Symmetry: C3
Subunit: 36 residues, 3 copies
């Protein structure tokens, strides 16, 4: 049961880290447009 909790936390971290990456990509595309 503690391993299952550890796995859920690790999967949530993975999801959020990808989320952060997609947000970084959006900000970069907006910067290219404003400076285009």
């Amino acid at each position: 049961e503690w391993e299952a909790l550890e796995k859920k936390l690790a999967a949530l971290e993975s999801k959020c880290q990808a989320x952060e990456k997609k947000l970084q990509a959006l900000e970069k595309k907006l910067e290219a447009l404003e400076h285009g």
Copy 2:
């Protein structure tokens, strides 16, 4: 203790899912701003 942690984990999973839905809507918003 166990139930209090599960409650917070479930709330965090729901928050991260809503976080993704917002990010997808902003992506469409940026695309429209560039396309105009």
Copy 3:
């Protein structure tokens, strides 16, 4: 081990909340530009 699980969850909650603040700032920039 339990304390480490609690510490991980709290760090993930703080990270998602910082994520939300950054998304809100991006949304405000997109709203300002699309109606400006």
